[PDB]
Amino acid sequence: SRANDAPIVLLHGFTGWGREEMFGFKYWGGVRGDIEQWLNDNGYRTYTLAVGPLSSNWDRACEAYAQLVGGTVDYGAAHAAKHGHARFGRTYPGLLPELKRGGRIHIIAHSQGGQTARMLVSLLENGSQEEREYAKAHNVSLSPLFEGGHHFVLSVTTIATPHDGTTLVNMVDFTDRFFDFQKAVLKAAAVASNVPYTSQVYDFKLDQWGLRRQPGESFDQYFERLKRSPVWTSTDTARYDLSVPGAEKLNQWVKASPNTYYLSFATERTYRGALTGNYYPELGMNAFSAVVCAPFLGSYRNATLGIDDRWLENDGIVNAFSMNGPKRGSTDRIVPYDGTIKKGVWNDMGTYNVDHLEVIGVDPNPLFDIRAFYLRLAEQLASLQPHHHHHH
Ligand SMILES: [Ca+2]
Ligand SMILES: [Zn+2]
């Protein structure tokens, strides 16, 4: 039964856009419909965040914070100095002023959004020692995001999240492939990548880096310009955080909070070949992944990096082994779901037979009851007890 009234906030991965972008084709729902609307219609108050798809998780967390409570994004003076981008970014009105008033939220996150969600919780609770020390030593102001002490997040749910990275980043032509993925997602929205649309269509929100699509420029052209830009070549990027070493580095500091419930869902869309031990894409997997990414993910081994046979099963973009929670470089505890959702640990909800884009409706799958999936999840989050209790 309903034990809390916290609203749900949806958070995308290294692809994703606001509700008004992409001509109204939703990242959360895609060709299937509008997940936020379904949840709202069913009595579960739900909102959606839109942050930089290619930006580092740090940048995304700072963007998510401002978007939630309102104000100007503040990446931190120490962080900005370190990486060479603007300290202040876009200004937001704030989706949920209730937060500065003792309210809490449930975050449902897909792909890299699960890293961002985890990071946000960490900053909200503990702040950043490094930013605190820099502000004192340099006499600069400090965002509350870096002071700690907030209590805004009741739970975090991740879907198809590369908690331990994805080996997709290891492809020799990953740079070109990754942008082709962006192009494949545009195509699912019926948007061409060789047309210089005058409307925005898809904002990568690279305000901090000073990058934006220019007049007369197609997405193909823009992407060629981003591949050579700091959001692709620096360590302050989605690209780095998505890698196995980058994810490991993130796990070293982004820990599960004992005040928050964590739920993890894995996805897989492959079969094992009996002769090679490799994994192959199943019928129905999105075409781009089936041809360009799945074959690699299902066969790439690297002993020195610690990529073994456990990593071969995949959803076409992320290795399933990486999804149940952070493990590499992490102290977090992961427990298989046994009927009780516990606070401060990863509740492994299992593996679902869907692909990376099917789980959010971007790619069709008439056998996947997506409406039921999200409604069941919503009822579960609504049933979570704030401060529960011990018994026989
Ligand atoms: Ca499909
Ligand atoms: Zn940054």
* CA gap 373, 87 in Å, rounded: 39
Cα 111 to averaged position of ligand 1 atoms, centre (Å):
17
In a domain, 2, yes or no: no
Provide CB contacts within 8 A for 277, sequence distance 6+.
309, 312
Q: Which ligand is nearest to the CA of 119?
A: 2
Cα 367 to averaged position of ligand 1 atoms, centre (Å):
9
* CA gap 53, 51 in Å, rounded: 6
- Specify burial of residue 117 (Cβ count, 10 A radius: 0-12, 13-18, 19+): buried
Q: With b meaning 16 or more CB within 10 Å and e meaning fewer, what string describes 125-155?
A: bbbbeebbebbeeeeeebbbbbbeebebbbb
**CA-based nearest residue to 224, from 272, 182, 252, 263:** 182
Q: Is 236 annotated in some ligand binding site?
A: yes
> How many Cα neighbours within 13 Å face the side chain of 258?
1
Asked if 63 and 71 touch (Cβ cutoff 8 Å), the reply is no
Asked if 299 and 281 touch (Cβ cutoff 8 Å), the reply is no
Q: Is 284 annotated in some ligand binding site?
A: yes
Which domain does 217 fall in, by range? 8-383
CA 358-359-362 angle, 5° bins: 45
In the block, residue with structure tokens 């798809």: 53
Q: Is 41 annotated in some ligand binding site?
A: no
Q: Is 358 annotated in some ligand binding site?
A: yes
Q: Torsions phi, psi of 95, nearest 5?
A: -80, -30
Q: Is 150 annotated in some ligand binding site?
A: no
Provide CB contacts within 8 A for 284, sequence distance 6+.
269, 355, 358, 365
Cα 79 to averaged position of ligand 2 atoms, centre (Å):
6
Number of domains present in the structure of the chain: 1
Strand ordering across the sheet containing 8-11: 46-49, 8-11, 105-110, 153-159, 261-267, 346-352, 334-336
* CA gap 240, 14 in Å, rounded: 12
Q: Which of 315, 332, 348, 355 is catalytic?
A: 315
Q: Which ligand is nearest to the CA of 357?
A: 1
Q: Is 392 annotated in some ligand binding site?
A: no
Q: Which ligand is nearest to the CA of 356?
A: 1
In a domain, 389, yes or no: no
Q: If DSSP states are collapsed to H, E and C, what string results for the chain?
A: CCCCCCCEEEECCCCCCCCCCHHHCCCCCHHHCCHHHHHHHCCCCEEEECCCCCECHHHHHHHHHHHHHCEEEECCHHHHHHHCCCCEEEEECCCCHHHHHCCCEEEEEECCHHHHHHHHHHHHHHCCHHHHHHHHHHCCCCCHHHCCCCCCEEEEEEECCCCCCCHHHHCCCHHHHHHHHHHHHHHHCCCCCCCCCCCCCCCCCCHHHCCCCCCCCCHHHHHHHHHCCHHHHCCCEHHHHHCHHHHHHHHHHCCCCCCCEEEEEEECCEEECCCCCCEEECCCCCHHHHHHHHHHHCCCCECCCCECHHHCCECCCCEHHHCCCCCCCCCCCEEECCCCCCECCEEEEEEECCCCCHHHCCCCCCCCCHHHHHHHHHHHHHCCCCCCCCCC
> What's the gap between Cα 297 and its chain centre?
19
Elucidated via: X-ray
In a domain, 3, yes or no: no
Cα 335 to averaged position of ligand 1 atoms, centre (Å):
30
Q: Which of 12, 56, 74, 111 is catalytic?
A: 111
In a domain, 225, yes or no: yes
> How many Cα neighbours within 13 Å face the side chain of 331?
7
Q: Strand 279-281 and strand 105-110: pairing?
A: unpaired
In a domain, 213, yes or no: yes
Cα 283 to averaged position of ligand 1 atoms, centre (Å):
8
Whether 199 is catalytic is no
Q: Torsions phi, psi of 114, nearest 5?
A: -75, -30
Q: Strand 261-267 and strand 270-272: pairing?
A: unpaired
Instruction: Provide the resolution (angstroms).
Output: 1.7
CATH number, domain with residue 295: 3.40.50.1820
Whether 356 is catalytic is yes
Whether 315 is catalytic is yes
Asked if 356 and 111 touch (Cβ cutoff 8 Å), the reply is yes
In a domain, 392, yes or no: no
In a domain, 390, yes or no: no
Q: Which ligand is nearest to the CA of 58?
A: 2
In a domain, 282, yes or no: yes
